[PDB]
Design a binder for these strands. Structure first.
Length: 547
RNA sequence: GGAAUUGACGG
């Protein structure tokens, strides 16, 4: 990071802040003002050495904790102290992250001053002016380019890191338009007009669009260019506009279709190109190849998903015609292509819906065979973290497969039935385990849909789950299953009495648990004790309401 | 009162 010199803290300064963070995440505060007073206390010892605290791996975390938990005056004080060295920080391994926090808080505060009126608006504008000669540099920089991305979001009232948007004064809008065109001008060696750009500077721009750090910045600009440029200069920098293939564009499109970064870029950008330009790329370069591309799970499949969302009725149907006969084979690796087709089929009024269900079942629960078990097919239950002495935590593919199963259960009743049968085919032993599993407990919970599961299947699930009433009651996850059971147990009151009895026998264990005492409420167990007839009455009112 | 290394780039 030669872009500025910050130096380092000494062991004395290190230990003070190393200790402030300790006692700050300890969160042993006995009031809010006490915790605030401690933050102010930190900001205080931090004055004059802010550039050092923010560029250290030991204390940069601390600084954004501070940026989030501090005053709006103090926030303006911290921002003001980064004056003159914003580019340096922007390009810095640790500081670039703090500038990001700083800027999101700042953006929130800028709205409060817009909707309830040195102001934060002017402060932001100062730093912006300070970065403008460096934007093209920043775009390619492995740290700075994230700050440039964020800035463009804020300036366009798009949504920010860590699902909220913020409104902006007109100057922010004017600044955005200024820096888009500054980049555009600085990407075209001049120039006269669209019609006067060399096929070598078009190639050089295309080259940026598949760069691992420049590409998201170019996606973003294309995403927000439409706000002023009703001609969309940057799109037209990348793709052509005539009804025929161009050998350079074609060679380029094939690379996008086979390259991870270029796949992202094509898919993120189709979601914001004008339909006429997207239909052109489809018909020219993909239409007659749609299955071959669909089979490219890591590159290009994703472009097919984007076509399915942003093309119009007639054409997403053609793609569905091509791809649904292939779906079960495509699910062998790329499960998320399943979601794109389910969603697309629904968007077109259940188009080919029966065939999609046929295919899903063909893959995850093929009628013909034995050992049919959608928990093995779809979650790979046997080769999973489920039930280890090895002290492993649930994985991200586990969470991903679980969510896919759940959406399958939402999709149709056939799948709800299939996984219930699959759960009963398990050894009791193993179904119980899933209830204690951070990720898989959600799958059990998802099955407990009273009006949707016939009373015989309910009763048999209840034969298993009931054995563990108390244990489920006191478990982080099992307690969420036990709550669902209050309703599931409708028209089956023998199982209600049996469960409520079990919980009550072990009352002091059940209460005096964080989770147990909530189950106690949800099952109205206090009524079960004080006023049985009133408890029974609730049961009857439940059965009537649900049936 | 609970789910985490997604197909690209950062502690």
């Amino acid at each position: 990071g030669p872009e500025a010199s910050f130096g380092v803290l000494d062991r004395e300064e290190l230990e003070y802040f190393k200790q402030a963070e300790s006692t700050l995440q300890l969160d042993a505060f006995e009031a809010p003002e006490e915790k605030f007073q401690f933050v102010t206390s930190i900001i205080e010892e931090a004055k004059g050495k802010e550039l050092k605290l923010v560029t250290s791996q030991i204390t940069s975390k601390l600084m954004e904790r501070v940026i989030l938990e501090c005053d709006e005056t103090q926030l303006k004080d911290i921002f003001q102290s980064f004056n003159g060295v914003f580019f340096g920080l922007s390009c810095h391994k640790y500081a670039s992250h703090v500038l990001e926090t700083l800027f999101v808080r700042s953006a929130a505060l800028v709205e409060r001053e817009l909707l309830t009126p040195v102001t934060m608006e002017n402060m932001f504008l100062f730093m912006l002016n300070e970065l403008k000669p460096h934007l093209k540099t920043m775009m390619n920089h492995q740290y700075a380019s994230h700050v440039l991305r964020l800035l463009i979001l804020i300036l366009s009232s798009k949504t920010l890191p860590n699902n909220k948007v913020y409104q902006t004064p007109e100057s922010f809008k004017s600044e955005l338009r200024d820096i888009i065109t500054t980049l555009y001008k600085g990407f075209t060696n001049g120039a006269e007009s669209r019609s006067d750009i060399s096929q070598s500077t078009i190639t050089k721009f295309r080259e940026y669009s598949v760069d691992k750090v420049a590409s998201p910045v170019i996606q973003l600009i294309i995403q927000v260019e439409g706000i002023f440029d009703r001609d969309r200069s940057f799109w037209r920098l990348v793709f052509n506009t005539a009804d025929e293939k161009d050998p350079k564009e074609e060679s380029f499109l094939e690379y996008l279709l086979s390259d991870p970064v270029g796949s992202h870029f094509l898919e993120n950008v189709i979601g914001s190109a004008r339909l006429k330009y997207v239909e052109r790329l489809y018909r020219l370069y993909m239409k007659d190849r749609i299955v071959k591309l669909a089979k490219r799970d890591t590159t290009g499949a994703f472009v097919v998903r984007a076509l399915l969302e942003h093309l119009k009725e007639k054409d997403v149907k053609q793609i569905l015609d091509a791809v649904v006969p292939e779906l079960s084979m495509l699910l062998n690796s790329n499960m998320d292509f399943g979601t794109a087709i389910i969603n697309a089929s629904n968007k077109q009024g259940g188009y080919l819906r029966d065939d999609v269900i046929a295919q899903l079942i063909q893959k995850y629960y093929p009628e013909k065979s034995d050992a049919k078990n959608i928990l093995e097919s779809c979650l790979l239950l046997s080769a999973s973290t489920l039930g280890n002495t090895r002290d492993d935590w649930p994985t991200a593919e586990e969470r991903r497969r679980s969510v896919f199963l759940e959406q399958l259960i939402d999709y149709d009743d056939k799948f709800l039935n299939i996984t219930i049968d699959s759960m009963l085919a398990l050894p009791e032993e193993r179904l119980i385990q899933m209830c204690y599993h951070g990720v898989f407990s959600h799958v059990v919970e998802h099955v407990l849909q009273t009006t949707r599961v016939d009373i015989i299947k309910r009763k048999m699930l209840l034969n298993i789950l009931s054995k563990e009433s108390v244990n489920l009651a006191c478990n982080v996850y099992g307690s969420h299953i036990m709550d669902k059971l209050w309703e599931f147990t409708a028209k089956l009151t023998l199982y209600k009495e049996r469960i409520a009895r079990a919980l009550v026998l072990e009352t002091e264990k059940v209460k005096n648990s964080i989770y147990g005492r909530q189950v106690w409420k949800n099952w109205k167990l206090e009524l079960y004790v004080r006023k049985m007839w009133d408890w029974k009455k609730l049961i009857k009112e439940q059965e009537f309401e649900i049936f």
